[PDB]
């Protein structure tokens, strides 16, 4: 899993360079101090590619070359089971309705419709998370 | 909802004139486009009950075969043939399970 983690470490070595150059040049050439609003977004976008980038190193040192990495691997190598996929679910239509009706309430500023929208979000996320773990009804 | 259009106009910021015209045009339109979408919701639930009898409960697990061939490993809910296809059951008005945890494949968490 070498050149998935290298894809982000190249992005870190630029953003952590473009954040040092920008915070040095605005310290000495802008009309005021260090231009804080843009240098924060570059010190924290080399935090995006460093949380993600230095995580796949620990999934490149722990994990051996799987057949999505080997150069000439035949198609009967990863012939096992992929895993679980939800074949159908009517919960994502309800979470989007619930988060939209918590965002109409924050747009029109109705505090009774924010709270009714947030309570719709939890019961529709409790639906989608609990969905493939219930068991039958015990009567 | 058209009798509380003194509250939809004030709290939801739409109008007092536009709420009657969505109540006048909508009194003809909205019962006519809920008849369509519910006659076609109901039959489309019926065909969901026939894809679980003819094929089985759609279990999520894929299992790439040794020549490609992503499959889905359905649970047949009935007898089987000597070939891998299941025998089609008959519909009987009873609610069919669509999820495998509801068929007791979850288990007990340890008492």
């Amino acid at each position: 899993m070498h050149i998935e983690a290298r894809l982000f470490e190249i992005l870190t070595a630029f953003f952590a360079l473009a954040a040092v150059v920008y915070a040095v040049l605005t310290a000495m050439f802008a009309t005021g101090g260090v231009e804080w609003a843009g240098t924060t977004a570059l010190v924290l976008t080399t935090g995006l590619t460093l949380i993600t980038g230095t995580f796949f190193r620990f999934v490149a040192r722990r994990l051996d070359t799987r057949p999505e990495d080997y150069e000439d691997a035949e198609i009967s190598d990863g012939a096992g089971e992929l895993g679980f996929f939800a074949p159908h679910s009517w919960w994502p239509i309800l979470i989007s309705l619930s988060f939209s009706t918590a965002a109409v309430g924050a747009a029109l500023w109705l505090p009774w419709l924010i709270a009714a929208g947030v309570a719709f979000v939890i019961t529709s996320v409790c639906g989608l998370v609990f969905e493939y773990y219930w068991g039958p009804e015990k009567h | 909802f058209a009798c509380m259009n003194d509250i939809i106009a004030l709290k939801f910021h739409i109008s007092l004139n536009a709420t009657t015209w969505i109540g006048r045009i909508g009194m003809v339109v909205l019962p006519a486009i809920v008849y369509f979408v519910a006659y076609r919701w109901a039959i489309s639930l019926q065909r969901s009950d026939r894809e679980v009898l003819e094929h089985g409960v759609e279990t999520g697990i894929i299992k790439r075969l040794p020549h490609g061939a992503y499959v889905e490993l359905h649970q047949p809910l009935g007898p089987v043939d000597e070939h891998g296809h299941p025998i089609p059951l008959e519909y009987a008005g009873a609610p069919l399970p669509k999820r495998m945890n509801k068929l007791g494949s979850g288990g007990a968490p340890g008492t």
């Binding site: 009774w112 009714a116 009804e137 009567h139 | 509380m4 509250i7 009873a94 609610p95």
Partner: peptide, 30 residues
């Protein structure tokens, strides 16, 4: 903030959800 329109909202999403949601716990699904 009062009147019979918030009475109706606070009936269907509080009183009748907790009356159907209890009935779904007591009764079965068949």
């Amino acid at each position: 903030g009062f009147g019979p329109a918030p009475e109706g909202m606070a009936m269907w999403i509080i009183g009748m959800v907790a009356a159907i949601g209890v009935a779904m716990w007591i009764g079965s699904r068949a």
